[PDB]
Amino acid sequence: SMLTIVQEALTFDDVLLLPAYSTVLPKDVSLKTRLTRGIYLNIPLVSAAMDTVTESRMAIAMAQNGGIGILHKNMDIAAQAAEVRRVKKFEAGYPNSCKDDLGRLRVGAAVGTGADTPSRVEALVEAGVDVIVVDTAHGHSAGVIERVRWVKQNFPQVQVIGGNIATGDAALALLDAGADAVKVGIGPGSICTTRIVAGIGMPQISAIDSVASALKDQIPLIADGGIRFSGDMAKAIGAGASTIMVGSLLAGTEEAPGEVEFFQGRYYKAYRGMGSLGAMALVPEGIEGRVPYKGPMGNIVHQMMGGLRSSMGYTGSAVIEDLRQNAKFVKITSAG
Amino acid sequence: SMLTIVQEALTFDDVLLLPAYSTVLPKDVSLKTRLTRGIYLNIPLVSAAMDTVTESRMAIAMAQNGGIGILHKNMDIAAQAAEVRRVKKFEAGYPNSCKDDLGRLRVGAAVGTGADTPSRVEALVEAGVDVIVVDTAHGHSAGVIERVRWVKQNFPQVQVIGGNIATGDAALALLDAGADAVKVGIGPGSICTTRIVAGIGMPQISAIDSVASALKDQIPLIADGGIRFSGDMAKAIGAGASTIMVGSLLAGTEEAPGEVEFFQGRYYKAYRGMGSLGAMALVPEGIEGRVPYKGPMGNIVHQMMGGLRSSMGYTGSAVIEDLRQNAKFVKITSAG
Amino acid sequence: SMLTIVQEALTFDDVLLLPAYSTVLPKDVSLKTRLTRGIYLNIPLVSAAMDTVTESRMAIAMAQNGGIGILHKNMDIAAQAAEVRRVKKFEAGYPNSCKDDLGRLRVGAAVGTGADTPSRVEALVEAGVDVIVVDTAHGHSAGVIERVRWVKQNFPQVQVIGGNIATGDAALALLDAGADAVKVGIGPGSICTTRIVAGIGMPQISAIDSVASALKDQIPLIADGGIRFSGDMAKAIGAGASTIMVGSLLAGTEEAPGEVEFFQGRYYKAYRGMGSLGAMAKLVPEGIEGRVPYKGPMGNIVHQMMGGLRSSMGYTGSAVIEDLRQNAKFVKITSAG
Amino acid sequence: SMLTIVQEALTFDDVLLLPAYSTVLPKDVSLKTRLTRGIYLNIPLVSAAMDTVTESRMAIAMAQNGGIGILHKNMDIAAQAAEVRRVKKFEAGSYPNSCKDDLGRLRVGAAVGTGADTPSRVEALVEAGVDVIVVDTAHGHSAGVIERVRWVKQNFPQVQVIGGNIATGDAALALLDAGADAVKVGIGPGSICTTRIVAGIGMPQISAIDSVASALKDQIPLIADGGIRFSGDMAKAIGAGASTIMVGSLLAGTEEAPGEVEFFQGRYYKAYRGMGSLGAMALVPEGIEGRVPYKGPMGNIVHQMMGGLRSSMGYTGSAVIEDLRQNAKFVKITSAG
Amino acid sequence: SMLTIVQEALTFDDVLLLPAYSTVLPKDVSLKTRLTRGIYLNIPLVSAAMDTVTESRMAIAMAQNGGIGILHKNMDIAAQAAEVRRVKKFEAGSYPNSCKDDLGRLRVGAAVGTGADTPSRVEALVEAGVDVIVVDTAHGHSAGVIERVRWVKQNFPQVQVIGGNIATGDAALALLDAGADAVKVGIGPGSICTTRIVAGIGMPQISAIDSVASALKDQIPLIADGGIRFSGDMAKAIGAGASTIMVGSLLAGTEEAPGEVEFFQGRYYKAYRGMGSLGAMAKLVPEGIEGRVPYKGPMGNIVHQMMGGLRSSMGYTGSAVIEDLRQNAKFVKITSAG
Ligand SMILES: C[C@H](Nc1ccc2ncc(CO)cc2c1)C(=O)Nc1ccc(Cl)c(N(C)C)c1
Ligand SMILES: C[C@H](Nc1ccc2ncc(CO)cc2c1)C(=O)Nc1ccc(Cl)c(N(C)C)c1
Ligand SMILES: C[C@H](Nc1ccc2ncc(CO)cc2c1)C(=O)Nc1ccc(Cl)c(N(C)C)c1
Ligand SMILES: C[C@H](Nc1ccc2ncc(CO)cc2c1)C(=O)Nc1ccc(Cl)c(N(C)C)c1
Ligand SMILES: C[C@H](Nc1ccc2ncc(CO)cc2c1)C(=O)Nc1ccc(Cl)c(N(C)C)c1
Ligand SMILES: O=c1[nH]cnc2c1ncn2[C@@H]1O[C@H](COP(=O)(O)O)[C@@H](O)[C@H]1O
Ligand SMILES: O=c1[nH]cnc2c1ncn2[C@@H]1O[C@H](COP(=O)(O)O)[C@@H](O)[C@H]1O
Ligand SMILES: O=c1[nH]cnc2c1ncn2[C@@H]1O[C@H](COP(=O)(O)O)[C@@H](O)[C@H]1O
Ligand SMILES: O=c1[nH]cnc2c1ncn2[C@@H]1O[C@H](COP(=O)(O)O)[C@@H](O)[C@H]1O
Ligand SMILES: O=c1[nH]cnc2c1ncn2[C@@H]1O[C@H](COP(=O)(O)O)[C@@H](O)[C@H]1O
């Protein structure tokens, strides 16, 4: 009677996209989309700001495949600015490359809300960073809203992203602060334990829908966490996402940080949450594990974009915006 | 909210047929039905157009038991036309046999939308094929709609089927194109990975219902994919299907293509999706595996038809059309 | 849309009974109920008409504990009438015993719709059977409806049950035929494969509710099949059942037919569906053949199952079976609950 | 010490045959061998005398492929003699490797016990044209078996006689002395066998064959009965001293084997049970009752087994069965190997 | 090398009995044997002195089938003597194979320790009419057991005495010189036993029986105590040199065994625990586990299945009497593959 149930929230496995009239072949579809209101990517993939996913090596390949990588903040201001420079000064000895006005590969960097943030932001913009990601566990906070407002007023020459959020109210708050894009994701990550530890969360399909409906395409959103297959990406874009941030899928690849480990005859790479005991050294909100060796990241990216191309062919979507505006879904049961 | 949820789509496991007043015994029911608006079968079974399910041997046996087999297109025009001739020229040394006006066993053949289709269609009709199946992964496309219209206009002496579809709008499109029957099924196949790779699909009970409700019995529909038991067949017919296409159930049988393999003391036969890496040599949308040796196909067909007879006895359906028009269902939970 | 979905049907695991104001202790509740409009039992338990559950030995113990056993029809007319006689002529060398007007232990017998049915029915009534169970897989048939009408017209001195059913329309049909009780159950049995083979069924809580709502307490119903625990029995009675038929729970007990088998150090007894390949030896099987572990004397299982139903009546404030039947309140639970 | 350990007995998995100098290709080897001192087979395979393995159908297919079937005794004298006649009167509607008698009729064997109906059974089988009488019990080193084989040889010298089951050299000499034309070796190795657990009796098959063969000194052949899972076991058995191999498990589940195909959980199976199981007897049971997967025509399985044996003879440099029997060299392997 | 490896010790699963020439059918064999030098049983079966196996009910049933029951010591002197009286005063309201004394009363045995209450316990049990006193500890080759056995024989010559538990020939000779009428063999083979893990002490049962039997030279019989899972183990034990077999696990879970039936996860069970478990003791570290065995129903069924299997074994070896199997059995050693 007094319990407030806002809605029955839906995840990726709760829905399926419906096929519609199509005259487009998967090989002919355009994967071009917008990361912010000022930055466009050639593929809707964004590599996760994590110490086991993105560093300079991963950020180069992402951009080289038409996407973008967000360097993690679990490194000192000097280390992060040095990683930005490595991506910006990289020269090929890739026609679908994601580059700036000066023909340099695009890169992003993650920042907190704390005391070293003004020095961190200044050093990253100076190093030539394209986008600043003001990212915490709870983006619907004065700390994130006001830190986003600070970066837009003091550094208008750089694009700013606010995260993480899962409601329409949070999106309007960050829109008013001057965010160029919002990062959507509260509890969906594969290594995430936020739901068990805090009982806080919002299944990703309803999270994207809530944010996208409030924004009214004024700024794009990044669907962050919980992508296991190429089908999830199509559902995310269909629900309202402009891009998709992945961690698990890019972890274990050659380009990801960490050396290959030989455990029980097989090859693995470490994969851990940024809120895990190992990543922090608050009660932990993430796990530490090992993912199998996937080889060059290019293979995984091609296989994922291949699946999204087929989905766009099934929905009759020639461009990303066609899938975003015309997608029709069906709700499925546990049997389906 | 901006998210468009058309309906809560239902699969076979989501529903159960209700028993109704009955004066008919299972051994007395008529399994006679229509494959197309010109072809009638003695049983509602159709063998899948797959390189591990239907070739000349399987088509003969399907036709001998009162069903029909669709010859696969993973062979050259000359091989496919020779397979049509093998079934049409077959002479028994079977009172329920499915035969044409000339007393020859009935056969069907699958065609694509590619460049070799006019030469393939012409050679199959010349070889005496009863039905042409214009089938792709996405039948709600200009490619399938216009090819179905081409076959009907250029070869009116042959029956044409369009597939695969899962919506009422797709059915009306193929109906207006001149299809004699529609093939329903987007994502329910046992070897299918369309749902994981593309995030596209429609649970089979809701797919059949949507198609059947739009058609208004103007042309029949084949419920294609996802049949595991004889109960699924009864649910499919009750939902609106006239015939049922099966791959998994007929794979592993003596008549199915492929030699028996002796693995770990047991006997198996290969079973693979037509969108698998092995079948194509687009990102794969099917798996490759082994099914246990089932022996002569006749046994499996009799067990399946036996179960459908019991269901018609429970519903008080003397004829297939009684189950199609009078069936009443209940929705069941994950506990049921 | 043209698809006809009558309702979202519920099973035992879909619901939970709510506790209500209570002044009654579980040890003080009355388990007395009615099998038919003429037969009353001291406990709501009925043993299944199965060749691995009820024969003379099981019907005696069920009647001794307050219940009733239904003898199976997978035996000739002479064998079945002899089994009726064994129960009726049994003398103790049990205060809650279910007995007739002549002080003899009560017994039931299953009959089909086939050609031997008039000879079978006549021989069972002559042997002193209390209730005739006209039992097939599909009781909403002319075969069952007309046979129940034949038994009532030709043998009014005996009580008649019709089954199996799962809808209100089927219940009204058997009520108009003169059935004294209806047996509810289409697809909930533990050994049943009707749902996989025919795609036919009705989850038991919705089946009981549909039948009970149509009947309006004119004749009782036997909730037949799908009982795994004592909680299911309380849910069944709360949904509208007057009695409960069990097979799996009484299988494996000392009293059940079959000799104990020593497999891999443990002790088991056979348990099979009446539509299995082995039980039938035409129709495709609709039941499985298996082994249940040895449970020892049936008395232990009956006491545990009646103990659980007593606690439930204590939780609902139900002093008598009719209090649970008329006052029970439920909540629907998800797959998480 | 008082404990008498005769030897460390070896099974199939304890040994491996060594490859030796070879000039023979597997396709060129001769699989011809002797079943008895008077009967020769074209392949060293025998189908077990079991109610789920050999009846007339299996015996015809066995004979057609160059082997022989031993019809089971779990049927009356009239039915068993009718099964012998069915094999002897069989005419092809082509099998060049067919095992046939002097009159060009397919060869067949029949199992007999030591019971009271044995003289009537033996007389009726010889009259029906049986080629070999198998006096087979669980314990062939008994007065019952020894004297019955001696009775068959003295009263019916026109027929070949086999004695079994045995596992020692002393048992072989006893049966050789009574006039057996061949001995059957196997105490405890059967796949469905529980003799080892129930009686604590047994002898691993490689040591059982070796013990029997060493005592006989090729005077009469021996049949390696039980425990064959793969084509490699057959080569090890022949190398150890066997002239033929009896199989039950491998031929069970085939089209030709007795029993109808059963559809359990989507798959196809056939029954397979020990002759000392509760079901086969209706002594404490010494065998289990189970289901084997449907293998289709027996011909496929036989070709796979004879193919594997051909490769083995190619590896050993064995042109004829007798070359493998006399020249095979083995190595003992550990639990790691 | 300085490490002393006495032998490669063998268990039940390491050996198989060989079939030999036979003229006697399993239904015709004699299962009669001797428990002590003065007591004979009609079947070679003894129920274990455990609080979840043998109380008066199990002992009555054991004797009625021709065996004997050893009453446990995890009860006061008055209760144990009352259990002896219950078996001795039992009268049938038919069991032709019953194991009875000179006065036609069902035979019974009782377990005693080496503790301070032992003289009062022994005196009260003999007074109650006990047939055999079992001086049983975890280690029978101790001054405590040897001297207590010697005390019982000297002070109560009218009663039979058993000494246990032992696993060597030296131990057997020590108890033989003490005046034991029979020895109980079993160090570490118990199903609920953890002696091997806790102390690293043990001797596989086939070699334990062989070592004891070879030293004794049939002067006194031995009871194969512990590690019997099937009827085949019993035949191997007798063939190795045992006159009787003590079983705990096989008789636990039966109707006659102490404890009420428990309904866990739809099934019926009875408790079964080691006498050296935490629960049985309530300052030695535990040497046994506490568990549940499935409900087996009347003990008669289990006993008939075991004696049936042993009958077949004697019919395979050509053993008309127990002594034929004991003296003529031939074995083969098998590998992990066999
Ligand atoms: C330890 C935990 N770790 C992380 C780390 C990275 C994360 N990244 C994303 C998400 C979204 O599920 C959660 C995350 C939690 C974490 O930051 N908790 C956490 C919980 C509640 C609040 Cl209000 C805050 N504010 C930002 C101070 C932080
Ligand atoms: C590789 C995959 N393979 C298959 C093959 C056979 C199938 N057969 C049936 C179904 C039913 O979902 C799917 C199938 C997918 C496939 O064809 N994908 C696919 C995906 C989207 C589009 Cl728009 C198209 N159009 C026909 C060009 C094809
Ligand atoms: C083979 C099966 N076997 C059984 C046997 C006993 C049963 N007893 C109860 C139930 C309740 O689901 C089903 C049963 C099925 C069975 O009777 N099928 C069956 C199916 C449909 C109809 Cl219309 C009929 N009519 C009565 C002739 C019979
Ligand atoms: C019940 C058992 N069943 C079988 C049946 C077939 C067998 N066939 C082969 C083997 C060899 O392991 C054992 C078998 C046991 C069986 O015959 N026991 C059995 C045990 C010992 C003896 Cl002395 C005898 N004599 C012949 C009377 C019989
Ligand atoms: C706790 C343990 N419990 C038991 C109880 C009964 C047993 N019964 C048999 C066996 C055979 O290993 C071991 C047993 C251990 C036990 O008594 N240990 C134990 C260990 C070493 C010694 Cl020298 C002694 N002496 C008698 C004082 C006792
Ligand atoms: O420890 C953590 N707790 C919760 N979420 C985390 C943690 N570390 C990273 N994340 C989020 O999870 C995403 C990775 O999601 P995934 O692709 O499902 O592995 C990241 O991009 C973050 O938004
Ligand atoms: O690779 C594939 N991907 C998806 N669906 C497939 C593929 N190959 C065949 N199918 C469909 O799956 C059906 C077989 O369904 P099944 O009876 O559930 O095995 C075929 O008749 C096709 O409609
Ligand atoms: O083979 C069969 N198929 C379907 N239902 C069966 C079969 N045999 C018995 N039944 C039903 O299942 C009940 C037993 O239900 P249980 O208590 O869940 O084991 C019986 O009382 C019958 O109503
Ligand atoms: O119940 C039984 N107990 C023990 N051995 C058996 C039984 N029935 C048959 N056998 C033997 O086991 C053989 C079959 O061995 P398999 O090829 O390993 O299955 C038969 O030829 C018999 O010698
Ligand atoms: O806790 C214990 N530790 C070790 N052995 C025990 C314990 N309790 C009883 N035993 C022995 O184990 C035997 C039971 O053996 P079982 O038949 O294999 O269960 C008893 O007769 C004792 O000799």
Author numbering:
A (entry chain B), B (entry chain A): 0 to 92, 206 to 393, 413 to 467
C (entry chain D): 0 to 92, 206 to 393, 412 to 467
D (entry chain E): 0 to 92, 205 to 393, 413 to 467
E (entry chain F): 0 to 92, 205 to 393, 412 to 467
Direct quotes from the study:
Here, we present the first high resolution co-crystal structures of A. baumannii, S. aureus, and E. coli GuaB proteins (cystathionine beta-synthase (CBS) domains deleted), each determined with a matched set of three different inhibitors bound.
We observed a tight overlay of structures across the bacterial strains, highlighting common critical interactions required for potency. This Glu residue underpins species selectivity, because the human homologs (IMPDH1/2) contain a Gln residue at this position that effectively prevents binding. Differences in the polarity of a particular key selectivity residue specifically (Ser250 in E. coli versus Ala252 in S. aureus and Ala249 in A. baumannii) was found to be critical for inhibitor interaction with GuaB which corroborates the observations of previous reports. G2 was bactericidal against A. baumannii at 5× Fu/MIC, and G1 was bactericidal above 2× Fu/MIC. GuaB Y445S/N/C and A.b.GuaB P25A/S are predicted to reduce the affinity of GuaBi-binding to the enzyme based on their location in the GuaB inhibitor binding site, but further studies are required to confirm this hypothesis.
